Symmetry: C2
Subunit: 221 residues, 2 copies
Protein backbone atom coordinates (compact mmCIF):
# COMPACT_ATOMS: atom_id res chain seq x y z
CA UNK A 1 0.00 0.00 0.00
CA UNK A 2 1.08 3.58 -0.62
CA UNK A 3 0.14 4.72 2.88
CA UNK A 4 2.71 2.38 4.39
CA UNK A 5 5.30 3.61 1.91
CA UNK A 6 4.64 7.27 2.73
CA UNK A 7 4.50 6.80 6.51
CA UNK A 8 7.82 4.95 6.32
CA UNK A 9 9.93 7.53 4.50
CA UNK A 10 8.05 10.47 6.02
CA UNK A 11 6.22 9.67 9.28
CA UNK A 12 5.30 13.35 9.81
CA UNK A 13 3.43 13.64 6.49
CA UNK A 14 0.06 15.36 6.69
CA UNK A 15 -2.74 14.96 4.21
CA UNK A 16 -3.63 17.94 2.09
CA UNK A 17 -6.78 18.47 4.13
CA UNK A 18 -4.82 18.24 7.37
CA UNK A 19 -2.21 20.63 5.99
CA UNK A 20 -4.79 23.21 4.96
CA UNK A 21 -6.74 22.90 8.24
CA UNK A 22 -3.56 23.16 10.19
CA UNK A 23 -2.35 26.29 8.35
CA UNK A 24 -5.59 28.20 7.96
CA UNK A 25 -6.30 27.86 11.70
CA UNK A 26 -2.89 29.13 12.80
CA UNK A 27 -2.84 31.98 10.30
CA UNK A 28 -6.36 32.97 11.40
CA UNK A 29 -4.87 34.36 14.64
CA UNK A 30 -2.68 36.65 12.50
CA UNK A 31 -5.27 38.29 10.25
CA UNK A 32 -5.28 35.84 7.37
CA UNK A 33 -8.77 35.38 5.90
CA UNK A 34 -10.19 34.35 2.53
CA UNK A 35 -10.30 37.62 0.61
CA UNK A 36 -7.47 39.61 2.17
CA UNK A 37 -4.91 36.92 1.44
CA UNK A 38 -2.68 36.33 -1.57
CA UNK A 39 -1.97 32.62 -1.96
CA UNK A 40 1.30 32.34 -3.85
CA UNK A 41 2.71 28.98 -4.80
CA UNK A 42 6.14 27.83 -5.89
CA UNK A 43 5.43 24.22 -6.87
CA UNK A 44 6.43 22.29 -9.96
CA UNK A 45 4.14 22.93 -12.88
CA UNK A 46 3.42 19.29 -13.63
CA UNK A 47 -0.39 18.88 -13.23
CA UNK A 48 -0.08 16.37 -10.40
CA UNK A 49 0.81 19.28 -8.07
CA UNK A 50 -2.56 20.96 -8.63
CA UNK A 51 -4.40 19.34 -5.70
CA UNK A 52 -2.48 21.30 -3.08
CA UNK A 53 -3.25 24.63 -4.72
CA UNK A 54 -6.83 23.61 -5.23
CA UNK A 55 -7.32 22.76 -1.54
CA UNK A 56 -5.65 25.96 -0.42
CA UNK A 57 -7.59 27.84 -3.07
CA UNK A 58 -10.92 27.07 -1.39
CA UNK A 59 -9.74 28.77 1.81
CA UNK A 60 -7.86 31.67 0.20
CA UNK A 61 -9.46 33.56 -2.64
CA UNK A 62 -6.98 34.87 -5.18
CA UNK A 63 -3.95 32.81 -6.17
CA UNK A 64 -0.59 33.43 -7.89
CA UNK A 65 1.68 30.69 -9.35
CA UNK A 66 5.31 31.65 -8.77
CA UNK A 67 6.63 28.16 -9.39
CA UNK A 68 9.04 27.12 -12.09
CA UNK A 69 10.58 23.78 -12.95
CA UNK A 70 10.84 21.38 -10.00
CA UNK A 71 9.13 23.98 -7.75
CA UNK A 72 11.96 26.54 -7.87
CA UNK A 73 10.91 30.21 -7.62
CA UNK A 74 13.30 31.19 -10.35
CA UNK A 75 11.43 34.38 -11.10
CA UNK A 76 13.83 35.51 -8.39
CA UNK A 77 13.66 38.96 -6.85
CA UNK A 78 12.01 40.53 -9.90
CA UNK A 79 9.42 37.80 -9.94
CA UNK A 80 8.82 38.39 -6.35
CA UNK A 81 8.23 42.08 -7.03
CA UNK A 82 5.52 41.03 -9.46
CA UNK A 83 3.82 38.90 -6.81
CA UNK A 84 3.74 41.64 -4.28
CA UNK A 85 1.49 43.56 -6.66
CA UNK A 86 -1.17 40.84 -6.52
CA UNK A 87 -1.57 41.34 -2.79
CA UNK A 88 -5.06 42.70 -1.97
CA UNK A 89 -5.66 46.08 -0.28
CA UNK A 90 -4.44 45.84 3.31
CA UNK A 91 -3.65 42.23 2.51
CA UNK A 92 -0.96 39.73 3.39
CA UNK A 93 0.68 36.90 1.53
CA UNK A 94 0.87 33.16 2.07
CA UNK A 95 3.73 31.43 0.16
CA UNK A 96 3.49 27.67 -0.24
CA UNK A 97 6.62 26.22 -1.83
CA UNK A 98 8.04 22.76 -2.07
CA UNK A 99 9.62 19.97 -4.06
CA UNK A 100 7.45 17.11 -5.10
CA UNK A 101 7.65 13.39 -5.72
CA UNK A 102 5.35 10.65 -6.94
CA UNK A 103 4.68 7.41 -5.11
CA UNK A 104 2.66 4.67 -6.80
CA UNK A 105 -0.13 2.34 -5.95
CA UNK A 106 2.61 -0.24 -5.78
CA UNK A 107 4.40 1.92 -3.26
CA UNK A 108 7.16 3.02 -5.64
CA UNK A 109 8.81 6.45 -5.20
CA UNK A 110 9.78 8.76 -8.06
CA UNK A 111 6.74 7.83 -10.12
CA UNK A 112 2.93 7.93 -10.20
CA UNK A 113 0.19 7.17 -12.74
CA UNK A 114 6.08 8.32 -15.70
CA UNK A 115 8.78 10.04 -13.65
CA UNK A 116 7.66 12.51 -10.96
CA UNK A 117 9.30 14.85 -10.42
CA UNK A 118 10.36 14.54 -14.08
CA UNK A 119 12.45 17.71 -14.08
CA UNK A 120 14.19 17.00 -10.76
CA UNK A 121 14.96 13.41 -11.79
CA UNK A 122 16.37 14.54 -15.12
CA UNK A 123 18.70 17.00 -13.43
CA UNK A 124 19.56 14.36 -10.83
CA UNK A 125 21.00 12.03 -13.50
CA UNK A 126 22.86 14.93 -15.10
CA UNK A 127 24.63 16.00 -11.90
CA UNK A 128 25.43 12.60 -10.58
CA UNK A 129 26.67 11.24 -13.88
CA UNK A 130 28.99 14.21 -14.09
CA UNK A 131 30.00 13.51 -10.54
CA UNK A 132 31.96 10.56 -11.77
CA UNK A 133 20.33 27.40 -23.34
CA UNK A 134 17.49 29.79 -23.89
CA UNK A 135 15.35 26.91 -25.15
CA UNK A 136 15.71 24.99 -21.85
CA UNK A 137 16.85 27.86 -19.66
CA UNK A 138 15.09 26.82 -16.48
CA UNK A 139 15.94 23.11 -16.57
CA UNK A 140 19.52 24.31 -16.58
CA UNK A 141 18.81 26.40 -13.52
CA UNK A 142 17.38 23.36 -11.78
CA UNK A 143 20.61 21.49 -12.57
CA UNK A 144 22.63 24.31 -11.06
CA UNK A 145 20.64 24.14 -7.79
CA UNK A 146 21.15 20.38 -7.59
CA UNK A 147 24.88 20.37 -8.28
CA UNK A 148 25.87 20.72 -4.58
CA UNK A 149 23.73 17.70 -3.77
CA UNK A 150 25.40 15.33 -6.19
CA UNK A 151 27.47 13.44 -3.68
CA UNK A 152 24.44 12.91 -1.53
CA UNK A 153 22.47 11.63 -4.48
CA UNK A 154 25.02 8.97 -5.36
CA UNK A 155 25.67 8.14 -1.74
CA UNK A 156 21.89 8.00 -1.11
CA UNK A 157 20.25 4.77 0.05
CA UNK A 158 17.06 5.36 -1.95
CA UNK A 159 17.52 8.12 -4.48
CA UNK A 160 13.90 8.79 -5.37
CA UNK A 161 13.36 9.69 -1.70
CA UNK A 162 16.54 11.63 -1.08
CA UNK A 163 15.92 13.62 -4.29
CA UNK A 164 12.88 15.66 -3.18
CA UNK A 165 14.58 16.14 0.18
CA UNK A 166 17.57 17.61 -1.64
CA UNK A 167 15.34 19.72 -3.87
CA UNK A 168 13.42 21.18 -0.94
CA UNK A 169 16.69 21.96 0.78
CA UNK A 170 17.96 23.94 -2.25
CA UNK A 171 14.56 25.62 -2.62
CA UNK A 172 14.51 26.61 1.04
CA UNK A 173 17.88 28.31 0.85
CA UNK A 174 16.84 30.16 -2.29
CA UNK A 175 13.45 31.33 -0.97
CA UNK A 176 15.03 32.56 2.26
CA UNK A 177 17.73 34.40 0.29
CA UNK A 178 15.03 35.99 -1.86
CA UNK A 179 12.75 37.03 0.97
CA UNK A 180 15.71 38.51 2.86
CA UNK A 181 16.54 40.84 0.00
CA UNK A 182 12.99 41.93 -0.67
CA UNK A 183 3.49 40.31 6.57
CA UNK A 184 4.30 37.21 4.54
CA UNK A 185 3.72 33.66 5.80
CA UNK A 186 5.81 30.79 4.46
CA UNK A 187 5.01 27.07 4.18
CA UNK A 188 7.83 24.93 2.85
CA UNK A 189 8.40 21.23 2.49
CA UNK A 190 7.93 18.13 0.41
CA UNK A 191 4.83 17.45 -1.64
CA UNK A 192 3.87 13.82 -2.11
CA UNK A 193 1.76 12.88 -5.06
CA UNK A 194 -0.24 9.67 -4.67
CA UNK A 195 -2.63 7.75 -6.99
CA UNK A 196 -5.78 9.55 -8.16
CA UNK A 197 -8.29 7.96 -5.75
CA UNK A 198 -5.96 8.72 -2.86
CA UNK A 199 -5.17 11.86 -0.85
CA UNK A 200 -1.81 13.49 -1.50
CA UNK A 201 0.55 14.37 1.30
CA UNK A 202 2.77 17.19 2.40
CA UNK A 203 5.77 17.07 4.70
CA UNK A 204 6.02 20.40 6.51
CA UNK A 205 9.57 21.52 7.10
CA UNK A 206 9.15 25.24 7.51
CA UNK A 207 6.22 27.26 8.74
CA UNK A 208 6.86 30.84 9.77
CA UNK A 209 5.74 34.45 9.46
CA UNK A 210 7.92 37.30 8.35
CA UNK A 211 7.43 41.07 8.28
CA UNK A 212 7.78 43.78 5.63
CA UNK A 213 11.07 44.52 7.39
CA UNK A 214 12.43 41.05 6.79
CA UNK A 215 12.70 39.38 10.16
CA UNK A 216 10.95 36.28 11.39
CA UNK A 217 8.01 37.34 13.48
CA UNK A 218 6.95 33.81 14.19
CA UNK A 219 8.08 30.27 13.79
CA UNK A 220 5.57 27.51 14.12
CA UNK A 221 8.21 24.85 13.92
Amino acid sequence: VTLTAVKKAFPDALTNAELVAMVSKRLSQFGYHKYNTLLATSLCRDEVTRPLEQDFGEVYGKHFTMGGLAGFPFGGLTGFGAMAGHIPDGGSCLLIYGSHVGVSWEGKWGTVAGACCGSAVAAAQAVTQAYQDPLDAQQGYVRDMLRPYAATLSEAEDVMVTLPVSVYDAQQKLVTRILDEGQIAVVGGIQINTPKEMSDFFVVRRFCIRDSSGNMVENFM
Copy 2:
Protein backbone atom coordinates in the same frame (compact mmCIF):
# COMPACT_ATOMS: atom_id res chain seq x y z
CA VAL B 1 -7.40 60.43 -24.50
CA THR B 2 -5.87 56.97 -24.38
CA LEU B 3 -7.94 55.69 -27.31
CA THR B 4 -6.32 58.22 -29.63
CA ALA B 5 -2.90 57.26 -28.30
CA VAL B 6 -3.50 53.53 -28.88
CA LYS B 7 -5.07 53.93 -32.33
CA LYS B 8 -2.09 56.06 -33.36
CA ALA B 9 0.76 53.70 -32.48
CA PHE B 10 -1.30 50.58 -33.25
CA PRO B 11 -4.26 51.18 -35.59
CA ASP B 12 -4.99 47.42 -35.79
CA ALA B 13 -5.47 47.03 -32.03
CA LEU B 14 -8.52 45.02 -30.99
CA THR B 15 -10.22 45.22 -27.65
CA ASN B 16 -10.01 42.21 -25.40
CA ALA B 17 -13.63 41.38 -26.13
CA GLU B 18 -13.03 41.73 -29.86
CA LEU B 19 -9.91 39.59 -29.59
CA VAL B 20 -11.69 36.81 -27.72
CA ALA B 21 -14.73 36.91 -30.03
CA MET B 22 -12.49 36.88 -33.03
CA VAL B 23 -10.43 33.90 -31.82
CA SER B 24 -13.11 31.72 -30.29
CA LYS B 25 -15.18 31.94 -33.49
CA ARG B 26 -12.32 30.95 -35.80
CA LEU B 27 -11.11 28.16 -33.54
CA SER B 28 -14.69 26.86 -33.27
CA GLN B 29 -14.39 25.54 -36.86
CA PHE B 30 -11.38 23.48 -35.72
CA GLY B 31 -12.80 21.67 -32.70
CA TYR B 32 -11.95 24.15 -29.98
CA HIS B 33 -14.67 24.33 -27.31
CA LYS B 34 -14.83 25.29 -23.64
CA TYR B 35 -13.94 22.06 -21.87
CA ASN B 36 -11.73 20.29 -24.41
CA THR B 37 -9.32 23.21 -24.63
CA LEU B 38 -6.20 24.04 -22.65
CA LEU B 39 -5.71 27.80 -22.50
CA ALA B 40 -2.01 28.39 -21.95
CA THR B 41 -0.64 31.87 -21.53
CA SER B 42 2.84 33.33 -21.77
CA LEU B 43 2.24 36.87 -20.54
CA CYS B 44 4.14 38.94 -18.00
CA ARG B 45 3.16 38.15 -14.45
CA ASP B 46 2.46 41.73 -13.43
CA GLU B 47 -1.24 41.80 -12.38
CA VAL B 48 -2.22 44.28 -15.08
CA THR B 49 -2.01 41.43 -17.63
CA ARG B 50 -4.78 39.48 -15.88
CA PRO B 51 -7.71 40.88 -17.90
CA LEU B 52 -6.74 39.04 -21.07
CA GLU B 53 -6.55 35.69 -19.33
CA GLN B 54 -9.76 36.41 -17.51
CA ASP B 55 -11.65 37.16 -20.74
CA PHE B 56 -10.25 34.10 -22.45
CA GLY B 57 -10.90 32.09 -19.30
CA GLU B 58 -14.67 32.55 -19.61
CA VAL B 59 -14.62 30.90 -23.05
CA TYR B 60 -12.04 28.20 -22.30
CA GLY B 61 -12.30 26.23 -19.10
CA LYS B 62 -8.96 25.18 -17.68
CA HIS B 63 -5.97 27.51 -17.85
CA PHE B 64 -2.17 27.21 -17.51
CA THR B 65 0.24 30.15 -16.95
CA MET B 66 3.46 29.50 -18.85
CA GLY B 67 4.62 33.09 -18.70
CA GLY B 68 7.76 34.39 -17.07
CA LEU B 69 9.21 37.85 -16.79
CA ALA B 70 8.15 40.22 -19.59
CA GLY B 71 5.96 37.45 -21.09
CA PHE B 72 8.85 35.14 -22.07
CA PRO B 73 8.09 31.39 -21.96
CA PHE B 74 11.40 30.67 -20.33
CA GLY B 75 10.22 27.34 -19.00
CA GLY B 76 11.53 26.37 -22.43
CA LEU B 77 11.10 22.90 -23.85
CA THR B 78 10.84 21.24 -20.43
CA GLY B 79 8.23 23.75 -19.39
CA PHE B 80 6.39 23.04 -22.51
CA GLY B 81 6.41 19.33 -21.71
CA ALA B 82 4.72 20.18 -18.44
CA MET B 83 1.99 22.12 -20.24
CA ALA B 84 1.20 19.34 -22.60
CA GLY B 85 0.17 17.27 -19.58
CA HIS B 86 -2.57 19.75 -18.69
CA ILE B 87 -4.28 19.16 -22.02
CA PRO B 88 -7.70 17.50 -21.51
CA ASP B 89 -8.59 14.04 -22.90
CA GLY B 90 -8.82 14.33 -26.68
CA GLY B 91 -8.10 18.01 -26.18
CA SER B 92 -6.15 20.71 -27.95
CA CYS B 93 -4.18 23.70 -26.78
CA LEU B 94 -4.53 27.44 -27.30
CA LEU B 95 -1.32 29.43 -26.55
CA ILE B 96 -1.72 33.16 -26.03
CA TYR B 97 1.64 34.91 -25.69
CA GLY B 98 2.74 38.48 -25.94
CA SER B 99 4.71 41.43 -24.63
CA HIS B 100 2.84 44.11 -22.81
CA VAL B 101 2.93 47.84 -22.25
CA GLY B 102 1.03 50.39 -20.22
CA VAL B 103 -0.55 53.54 -21.62
CA SER B 104 -2.02 56.11 -19.25
CA TRP B 105 -5.12 58.19 -18.97
CA GLU B 106 -2.87 60.99 -20.10
CA GLY B 107 -1.96 58.95 -23.14
CA LYS B 108 1.57 58.13 -21.97
CA TRP B 109 3.22 54.85 -23.05
CA GLY B 110 5.37 52.67 -20.79
CA THR B 111 3.25 53.37 -17.73
CA VAL B 112 -0.23 52.95 -16.25
CA ALA B 113 -1.89 53.51 -12.86
CA GLY B 114 4.75 52.92 -12.31
CA ALA B 115 6.64 51.41 -15.25
CA CYS B 116 4.81 48.81 -17.37
CA CYS B 117 6.33 46.60 -18.52
CA GLY B 118 8.63 47.06 -15.51
CA SER B 119 10.84 44.09 -16.33
CA ALA B 120 11.16 44.88 -20.05
CA VAL B 121 11.94 48.55 -19.32
CA ALA B 122 14.58 47.59 -16.77
CA ALA B 123 16.32 45.31 -19.24
CA ALA B 124 15.93 47.98 -21.93
CA GLN B 125 18.05 50.46 -19.95
CA ALA B 126 20.61 47.76 -19.19
CA VAL B 127 21.16 46.80 -22.85
CA THR B 128 21.11 50.23 -24.31
CA GLN B 129 23.37 51.74 -21.68
CA ALA B 130 25.85 48.99 -22.40
CA TYR B 131 25.41 49.71 -26.05
CA GLN B 132 27.41 52.84 -25.60
CA ASP B 133 22.40 35.26 -10.81
CA PRO B 134 20.18 32.64 -9.29
CA LEU B 135 18.42 35.35 -7.29
CA ASP B 136 17.36 37.23 -10.45
CA ALA B 137 17.85 34.44 -12.95
CA GLN B 138 14.96 35.28 -15.23
CA GLN B 139 15.45 39.04 -15.41
CA GLY B 140 18.87 38.15 -16.74
CA TYR B 141 17.26 35.96 -19.36
CA VAL B 142 15.04 38.84 -20.39
CA ARG B 143 18.15 40.99 -20.82
CA ASP B 144 19.71 38.33 -23.02
CA MET B 145 16.64 38.27 -25.32
CA LEU B 146 16.71 42.06 -25.63
CA ARG B 147 20.42 42.40 -26.37
CA PRO B 148 19.99 42.08 -30.18
CA TYR B 149 17.45 44.89 -30.09
CA ALA B 150 19.69 47.43 -28.42
CA ALA B 151 20.52 49.45 -31.49
CA THR B 152 16.87 49.68 -32.35
CA LEU B 153 16.03 50.84 -28.87
CA SER B 154 18.49 53.72 -28.95
CA GLU B 155 17.68 54.54 -32.54
CA ALA B 156 13.94 54.35 -31.72
CA GLU B 157 11.71 57.40 -32.14
CA ASP B 158 9.56 56.58 -29.10
CA VAL B 159 11.16 53.91 -26.97
CA MET B 160 8.19 52.95 -24.81
CA VAL B 161 6.41 51.95 -28.03
CA THR B 162 9.29 50.27 -29.82
CA LEU B 163 10.08 48.29 -26.65
CA PRO B 164 7.02 45.98 -26.59
CA VAL B 165 7.40 45.60 -30.34
CA SER B 166 10.96 44.41 -29.78
CA VAL B 167 9.90 42.16 -26.92
CA TYR B 168 7.17 40.49 -28.95
CA ASP B 169 9.62 39.97 -31.78
CA ALA B 170 12.09 38.16 -29.47
CA GLN B 171 9.23 36.19 -27.88
CA GLN B 172 7.90 35.15 -31.29
CA LYS B 173 11.24 33.74 -32.38
CA LEU B 174 11.60 31.86 -29.11
CA VAL B 175 8.07 30.39 -29.10
CA THR B 176 8.45 29.24 -32.71
CA ARG B 177 11.83 27.67 -31.91
CA ILE B 178 10.27 25.89 -28.94
CA LEU B 179 7.20 24.62 -30.75
CA ASP B 180 9.36 23.36 -33.62
CA GLU B 181 11.38 21.16 -31.30
CA GLY B 182 8.44 19.78 -29.38
CA GLN B 183 -3.16 20.46 -32.56
CA ILE B 184 -1.93 23.66 -30.93
CA ALA B 185 -3.23 27.12 -31.83
CA VAL B 186 -1.05 30.17 -31.31
CA VAL B 187 -2.00 33.82 -30.68
CA GLY B 188 0.91 36.22 -30.47
CA GLY B 189 1.26 39.96 -30.27
CA ILE B 190 1.33 43.04 -28.12
CA GLN B 191 -0.84 43.48 -25.06
CA ILE B 192 -1.86 47.02 -24.21
CA ASN B 193 -2.80 47.83 -20.67
CA THR B 194 -5.07 50.85 -20.24
CA PRO B 195 -6.59 52.60 -17.16
CA LYS B 196 -8.90 50.56 -14.94
CA GLU B 197 -12.26 51.89 -16.22
CA MET B 198 -11.11 51.28 -19.78
CA SER B 199 -10.85 48.18 -21.99
CA ASP B 200 -7.37 46.86 -22.66
CA PHE B 201 -6.15 46.14 -26.15
CA PHE B 202 -4.26 43.50 -28.05
CA VAL B 203 -2.35 43.84 -31.29
CA VAL B 204 -2.51 40.51 -33.12
CA ARG B 205 0.66 39.69 -35.00
CA ARG B 206 0.44 35.94 -35.28
CA PHE B 207 -2.56 33.66 -35.38
CA CYS B 208 -2.04 30.13 -36.63
CA ILE B 209 -2.65 26.45 -35.99
CA ARG B 210 0.02 23.81 -35.81
CA ASP B 211 -0.09 20.01 -35.62
CA SER B 212 1.45 17.39 -33.34
CA SER B 213 3.91 16.90 -36.20
CA GLY B 214 5.08 20.49 -36.09
CA ASN B 215 3.95 22.12 -39.30
CA MET B 216 1.61 25.03 -39.74
CA VAL B 217 -1.80 23.69 -40.61
CA GLU B 218 -3.34 27.11 -40.81
CA ASN B 219 -2.46 30.74 -40.80
CA PHE B 220 -5.14 33.26 -40.13
CA MET B 221 -2.84 36.15 -40.88
